[PDB]
Amino acid sequence: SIEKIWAREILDSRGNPTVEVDLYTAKGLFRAAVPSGASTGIYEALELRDGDKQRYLGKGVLKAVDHINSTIAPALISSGLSVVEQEKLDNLMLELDGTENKSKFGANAILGVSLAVCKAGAAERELPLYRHIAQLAGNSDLILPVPAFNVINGGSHAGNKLAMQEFMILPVGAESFRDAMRLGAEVYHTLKGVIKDKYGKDATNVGDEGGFAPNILENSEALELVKEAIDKAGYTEKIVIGMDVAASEFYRDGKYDLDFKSPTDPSRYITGDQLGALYQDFVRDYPVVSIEDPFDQDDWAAWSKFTANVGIQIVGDDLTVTNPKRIERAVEEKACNCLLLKVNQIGSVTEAIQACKLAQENGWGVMVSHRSGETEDTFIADLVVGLCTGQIKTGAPCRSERLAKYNQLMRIEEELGDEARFAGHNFRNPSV
Amino acid sequence: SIEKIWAREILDSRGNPTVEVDLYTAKGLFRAAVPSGASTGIYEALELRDGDKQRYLGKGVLKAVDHINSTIAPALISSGLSVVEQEKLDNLMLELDGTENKSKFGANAILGVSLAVCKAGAAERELPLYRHIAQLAGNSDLILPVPAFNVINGGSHAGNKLAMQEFMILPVGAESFRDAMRLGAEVYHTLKGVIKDKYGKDATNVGDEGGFAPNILENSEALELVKEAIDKAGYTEKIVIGMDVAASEFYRDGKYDLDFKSPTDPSRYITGDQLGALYQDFVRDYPVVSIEDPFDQDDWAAWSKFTANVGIQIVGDDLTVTNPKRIERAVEEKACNCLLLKVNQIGSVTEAIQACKLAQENGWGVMVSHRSGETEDTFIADLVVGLCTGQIKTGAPCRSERLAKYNQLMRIEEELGDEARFAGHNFRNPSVL
Ligand SMILES: O=C(O)[C@@H](CO)OP(=O)(O)O
Ligand SMILES: [Mg+2]
Ligand SMILES: [Mg+2]
Ligand SMILES: [Mg+2]
Ligand SMILES: [Mg+2]
Hints:
Two copies of one chain form a homodimer. The first copy, chain A, is α/β, with parallel strands linked by helices. In chain A, about 40% of the residues lie in helices and about 15% in strands. In chain A, strands 4-5-6-9-10-11-12-13 form an eight-stranded mixed beta barrel, surrounded by five helices. In chain A, strands 1-2-3 form a three-stranded antiparallel beta sheet, with helices on one face. In chain A, strands 7-8 form a two-stranded antiparallel ribbon. Chain A is globular. One magnesium ion binds next to loops of chain B. Chain B: One of its GO terms (biological process) is canonical glycolysis. Chain B: InterPro entries: Enolase, Enolase-like_C_sf, Enolase-like_N, Enolase_C, Enolase_CS, Enolase_N.
């Protein structure tokens, strides 16, 4: 059973409080922490913050922590359920909170326990984490995913004018996971120089996810820099490009604002048809193979029309928020062909696994994802392997809240030894 | 005894390779990894790199990793020594290397085993890491250090003109380590707002250690920005300022170039006297209580004279490189009154505890330090408690290779319960508490 749970406030990678949980069994101690987004969709389960403006500027998580220490912990303990029963323990937590969006305890409260139970569960089974997860998910071929490295940053929170949030590289042609990391790192460090040469040393500092934020406006120019770094590294044949537009962040009165970090002005705003045609030029002119949140989380028509007019991967994030009910609708409407999977959008492991199986059941790709506020926790590296999804984005190869995950994928690859496989060019559908 | 040792290459926080080590005993797996400097002292132990231009720009550590797997690991397994015997295991390795600066295997090879052995030993003793360290050190006060947070990055850690490396805030007034975390973070976030309003959002990206990299040249202006944020956060009484100049990075033919990241022009260079005088202004205009590497690593005359002429903490880093020989010379010349402690400048736990005790017996402070290239490893967190040094610099409260250490110190404080004490205004000299 569970002997003890102890939750506390720690600092995530931007220096804001988040929830960490210690859960103890007769096997020992298991610790997990909860990440936090900046471009959070309106449909995500509630991140409970304290809002005491005199303390971490309103961002403390004492209330979430106390819900764990005062309510969740006593309950789960006295239940006497084994930590192998992921689903029953998660449902219990879900009934206890009693709300649909987990607004009673916070999803950051429930998830911190849910992850730590999962780690306890692995060890109760004497499996490493990635194999326990695969058992919870009915999987067997524990493929290593292609990493997607966020190398240039724009968007809502970025010190520059660049509207589109993330421009990523995917080493689809590397020989193994370890190899992909090496390609990603070389391109990254090459990019830095390409930026320094073109823009000045000032332009080479990092944003939240470890990528660079040059002082540029044109999304075509970012892609241009990324493709140059890929050539100059010499991997044109091995590395492709993915984008996270995060379009909800610049949605304005039913049109779209590509300049939005400027102080307001509706004359620039373009329509979804105009924004769709830009992407089609991007897909024609650059090796872009994936685009995430190309439209607002509510602009369903633009998603379906786009998806039915392209061959590339189209990824729902803010559209789907790892939520089964929202995914069925995207399925019905053929909104996209890939789920971005964020445990903290829905708020328990069990519901994330279910979101995963539903996407995969209906022929979708699935990409596991960090939040832009991460911790040293590495759960998601085990999650992507265990879920056989074949793709993960968890940062630039820079800042150790991103590398903690990359390094742990290398450890998994090495742990699988001779039986380890890399998704490479089958990242969208590694089930082949 | 040790059952097996597996080393691998992982990536550090700048996305370069570094050593990590998995050590197996009866108790299980003990893992540690090796950090890596950018402004590395000329006298530092050798960090062994591959030098293969077709692989991570020559920055691979395949060689150091193979030294561990193929030579050091059977060496330590054959000895049959318990992991608790830090000193014996460290000497074993130092003798097998047999060079002064560890250039046969690399400081990076030796250290990663040394750290792992260390964590395995704490498990064997049934002790948390910081207590085991305290026992190797012969301490039983486990005081929590004042954290020194590098909130504006310059020099070799940031893409800007700003020449001095590090502008640090020290919550000397804090009630506890956990409360020092809150003050640090609130000032950091306040400073993001100050820098944003004054220089634009483009000035709020960060350099290697998590501090803002604003587009500035004047070191006075960085100090100014920090003061302003302290004040706006409401903490002028409770928080003071520290600097790492690292003048070695900008020492140019007997002079100093405060614009070294600009196209070379030797007229802009100033003498060490001018540099010193500049330090005297900072000390009077700002609550600067500590300055690290204010002169070049070989510029001993400028060091002794500046130190005899101030009552603040003066920190040796590239001057001392965590090395007992260089420390003795610094004590004799009165170069400085604080040691910067960096396991990887010297290359083993045992050596680093020895360099520490040395400083403390000569009445020096000791500030434990991360490197600019870090990992998810939280060793130095337990190390600073176990060594009772009362001060640690391990980043801005931003980037988890920093926050993994700060979060660990909060966990250690919480674990000490009511026995927990906070160094505070005693960060130079915590033994009196
Ligand atoms: O103080 C220093 O000099 C260190 C650590 O902050 O930087 P580097 O690791 O680059 O030497
Ligand atoms: Mg988002
Ligand atoms: Mg997104
Ligand atoms: Mg240095
Ligand atoms: Mg230094």
